[PDB]
């Protein structure tokens, strides 16, 4: 058999990979976030210069397989205050935003269509009527609670996914005093937080998610897993047309490979490219978290400058990055 | 004669190539070898720490003289651009598409006369004559096709394998128009070119080269 | 970074893609895919193989000297590359129209 630290080998009790540990809080650092939620689209292979001192491929180039995760900006819909107790952390109270998008309202219902859409109705009414209760609760969190987690949901509509329920979750707000975290959450109420503001493509992060099920084996598969030290290679912007165009390559193109991502679609929003494989198949939600413990060796610290990113047809033996140059080489078709 | 050893190898000629106008050192290894080379020739001729074909065998892969240099066809486009940028404009750099890419191990060339391997291509010989501007002779050293590896050629003298006949050594010396000595370097290492590199005014030998070998090289090169 | 041309299909071969094969004559064959690698294996002549560029070429159907870096030269080369490709595309379209006629 395998390692005894992973048994009992049973199905994960959650579709979305839940964070089990957040980086330790620091008052010296100002107020920011630590985790983000994305959707796996697939991976390609890229050619990257190797600036690895002491290595035998120093000042050379290697080919690396890199997973692409679409990460549309996340909407902060609430905040949760946690108070330390002799029996552990306890959720003291929760404050939600006044207006919640249908994407996050669909989470509370198994049948949103048959529902009367009554979620947060009186909550929105009391929010508009009197703000003294909201002020009392926020003052309660900043005075008593020691850990602050913002409720954020993903804009699943932008992703080419048939699912319309947003994966609501909590992001621990590490940095500054408790009042600073509360002020940060209130300012960011109803707004959007971007992965460009959270991660910046040169740090060492961990990816967590549920693996894909292999059926029945002599149970094997569909288990919660935590990959450590997955390096971000590029946080590409969806709007920019140079997202998949490096400086050594030009050739204006998009990260979505020609022919589309297999069983996922076309990536149009901000995407994240991580070195190596990540758990879960395509179209499954993955969670990203910062480094709990600081460890930047040369591999985790060296800068990265991509040279060429493959966008060939992953469906089948693709042999052309873009239909433009495909038509330039291939003879003119009958159509 | 200067004693140096790249990493833990006494075959300095494998990891580096020496000419009368420029020097090349391996990339990705230890900077001590490059510093040692720069300490003796940095202020005289340029030294480029580059690689050919993504390997540290550039010394035995690249062959040339003070006028021009030749690189194997396996050299990358970026590598060739880096070499041209580092090397002076008067130092011509040309790529050779030969069946034996080991130019340094097949052909030994001086500033005036060059000896190539017996199976060198006519186009390669024409390119060598055009670039290096030297007379190319298709012969063999000590009966071995690897003339560039078994023989060391320079402007003031040449070194060959000690097993060669006296008449053969005299014929090679007359053909090369320079003195020739049949000896060994690095304590019996028969690959003189791999074990030692000699320029017009200086020579570099491995750390395992004996005192008698160093004295013989100094007498032959008159350095 | 060189995008090579396959021996058999004569198409563009990119890093990672295809297979590389070396002969005892030190001649190197690059294959754009397994199909073209296999097609070399039983030794089909590209010019007889219908979908190869060599067939489409010989059937009527269609720098070793390093250069010093110059920003102006690179910009001029990049600008001229698009125009050259556009001219080639127009010539191919006219050739296709002539072939159809």
């Amino acid at each position: 058999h395998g390692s005894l630290g992973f048994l009992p080998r049973k199905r994960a009790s959650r579709q979305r990979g839940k964070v089990k540990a957040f980086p330790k809080d620091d008052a010296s650092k100002p107020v920011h976030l630590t985790a983000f939620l994305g959707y796996k689209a697939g991976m390609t292979h890229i050619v990257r210069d190797l600036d690895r001192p002491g290595s035998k491929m120093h000042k050379r180039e290697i080919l690396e397989a890199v997973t692409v995760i679409e990460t549309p900006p996340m909407v902060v819909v609430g905040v949760v205050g946690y108070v330390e107790t002799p029996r552990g952390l306890r959720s003291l109270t929760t404050v939600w935003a006044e207006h919640l998008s249908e994407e996050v309202k669909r989470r509370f219902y198994k049948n949103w269509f048959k529902s009367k859409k009554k979620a947060f109705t009186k909550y929105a009414k009391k929010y508009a009527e009197s703000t003294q209760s909201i002020n009392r609760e926020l003052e309660r969190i900043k005075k008593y609670c020691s850990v602050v987690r913002v409720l954020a949901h993903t804009q699943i509509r932008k992703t080419p996914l048939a699912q319309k329920k947003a994966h609501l979750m909590e992001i621990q707000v590490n940095g500054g005093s408790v009042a600073d975290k509360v002020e940060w959450a209130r300012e960011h109420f109803e707004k959007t937080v971007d992965i460009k503001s959270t991660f910046e493509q040169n740090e060492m992060i961990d990816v967590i998610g549920v693996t894909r099920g292999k059926g029945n084996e002599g149970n094997a598969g569909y288990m919660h897993r935590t990959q450590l030290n997955s390096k971000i290679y590029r946080i590409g912007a969806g709007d920019d047309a140079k997202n998949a165009s490096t400086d050594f390559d030009a050739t204006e193109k998009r990260i979505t490979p020609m022919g589309g991502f297999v069983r996922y679609g076309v990536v149009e929003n901000d995407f994240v490219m991580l070195n190596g494989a990540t758990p879960g198949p395509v179209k499954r939600v993955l969670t990203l978290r910062k480094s709990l413990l600081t460890h930047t060796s040369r591999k985790a610290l060296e800068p990265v400058s991509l040279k060429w990113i493959d966008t060939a047809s992953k469906f089948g033996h693709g042999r052309f990055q873009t239909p433009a140059e495909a038509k330039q080489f291939l003879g003119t078709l009958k159509k | 004669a200067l004693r140096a050893q790249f990493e833990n190898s006494n075959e300095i000629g494998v990891f580096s190539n020496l000419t009368n106008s420029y020097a090349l050192v391996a990339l990705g290894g230890s900077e001590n070898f490059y510093s040692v080379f720069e300490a003796e020739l940095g202020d005289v001729v340029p030294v480029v720490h580059t690689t050919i074909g993504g390997t540290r065998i550039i010394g035995r892969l690249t062959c040339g003289n003070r006028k021009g240099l030749l690189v194997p066809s396996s050299t990358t486009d970026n590598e060739l651009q880096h070499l041209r940028n580092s090397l002076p404009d008067p130092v011509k750099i040309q790529r050779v598409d030969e069946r034996l890419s080991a130019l340094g191990n097949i052909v030994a060339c001086n500033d005036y006369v060059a000896l190539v391997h017996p199976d060198i291509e006519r186009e390669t010989e024409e390119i060598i004559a055009d670039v290096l501007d030297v007379e190319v002779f298709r012969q063999t050293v000590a009966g071995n096709v690897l003339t560039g590896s078994y023989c060391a050629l320079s402007n003031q003298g040449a070194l060959v394998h000690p097993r060669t006949s006296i008449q053969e050594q005299d014929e090679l010396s007359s053909l090369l128009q320079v003195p020739l000595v049949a000896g060994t370097i690095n304590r019996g290492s028969d690959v003189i070119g791999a074990g030692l590199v000699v320029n017009d005014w200086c020579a570099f030998a491995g750390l395992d080269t004996t005192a008698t070998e160093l004295a013989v090289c100094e007498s032959i090169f008159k350095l | 970074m060189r995008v090579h041309t396959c021996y058999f299909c004569s198409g563009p071969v990119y890093p990672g893609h295809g297979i590389m094969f070396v002969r005892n004559d030190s001649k190197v064959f690059r294959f754009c895919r397994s199909k073209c690698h296999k097609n070399f294996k039983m030794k089909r002549n590209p010019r007889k193989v219908a979908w190869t560029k060599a067939y489409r070429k010989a059937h009527g159907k269609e720098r070793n000297v390093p250069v010093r870096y110059d920003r102006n030269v690179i910009a001029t080369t990049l600008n001229a590359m698009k125009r050259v490709s556009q001219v080639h595309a127009k010539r191919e379209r006219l050739f296709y129209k002539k072939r159809l006629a």
């Binding site: 050594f248 390559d249 330039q328 | 486009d77 | 970074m1 060189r2 690179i74 080369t77 990049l78």
Partner: peptide, 17 residues
């Protein structure tokens, strides 16, 4: 100190300049 595009639009800019 500045970099140059090695290959663009399916053509090696370095090899065609």
């Amino acid at each position: 100190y500045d970099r140059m595009p090695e290959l663009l639009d399916g053509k090696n800019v370095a090899d065609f300049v």
